[PDB]
Write a protein that binds this ligand. Structure first.
Ligand SMILES: NC(=O)c1ccc[n+]([C@@H]2O[C@H](COP(=O)([O-])OP(=O)(O)OC[C@H]3O[C@@H](n4cnc5c(N)ncnc54)[C@H](O)[C@@H]3O)[C@@H](O)[C@H]2O)c1
Length: 204
């Protein structure tokens, strides 16, 4: 139908803060999210490497994932919304690690055609959590791949920004084991980035 796309920083900010007041996260859930923002790539990366299974993990890490998953029972979005995200070349596969980018900073049109073939009109399963923003913010917009996610109403999604260890991200978190369908993939006006548009679905 129509996804709300925030255009103004101070509005997104207010809307998001308006959601956070309602969540009533347990003190325990809050300590688990704070810690996630300080260590996302470690956690998301173990999740990827053991394809979801958390039995090997230390007893702390298991306490932290269970609390993150639980959190989303309190955190859902009240309307259709667009979230944004930036990624580096490895996002597409090891093959694109050292080939997606030319020497001047442009997207190698060939790798783009390969990636488009490999991902366009297909589902992707992400084993880790997905961190996003309410807009294309300055910091993560410098990255070569920008993904705009369509998130439906009532879907699991949470504005954790207020208790993030870091600033300027307008951060919305989505749950792990989420799956999304990629609808479009083109280049930006200057050819320095790929814009992926994707439809978000559930978890497991
Ligand atoms: N990236 C964003 O759009 C965004 C938005 C808001 C907040 N954040 C915050 O920044 C930090 C999170 O960083 P992140 O999002 O880069 O961590 P991540 O765990 O999602 O990804 C880390 C690195 O691995 C890549 N990657 C992602 N999925 C992959 C996959 N399936 N296979 C191989 N590589 C993959 C990413 O492009 C990045 O280079 C946290 O502090 C979080 O709060 C990020």
């Amino acid at each position: 139908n129509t996804y709300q796309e925030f255009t103004n920083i101070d509005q997104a900010k207010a809307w998001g803060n308006a959601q956070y007041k309602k969540y009533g996260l347990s003190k325990s859930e809050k300590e688990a999210i704070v810690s996630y923002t300080k260590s996302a790539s470690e956690i998301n990366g173990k999740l990827r490497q053991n394809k979801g299974v958390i039995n090997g993990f230390p007893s702390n890490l298991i306490k932290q994932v269970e609390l993150l998953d639980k959190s989303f029972n309190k955190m859902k979005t009240p309307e259709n919304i667009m979230l944004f995200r930036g990624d580096d070349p490895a996002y597409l596969g090891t093959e694109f690690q050292n080939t997606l980018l030319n020497s001047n900073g442009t997207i190698n049109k060939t790798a783009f055609e390969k990636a488009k073939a490999k991902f366009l009109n297909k589902d992707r399963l992400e084993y880790g959590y997905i961190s996003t923003s309410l807009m294309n913010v300055s910091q993560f917009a410098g990255r070569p791949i920008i993904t705009k996610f369509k998130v439906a109403k009532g879907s699991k999604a949470g504005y954790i920004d207020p208790i993030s260890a870091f600033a300027g991200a307008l951060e919305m978190l989505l749950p792990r084991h989420s799956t999304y369908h990629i609808d479009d993939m083109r280049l930006s006006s200057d050819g320095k980035q790929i814009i992926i548009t994707a439809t978000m679905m559930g978890t497991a």
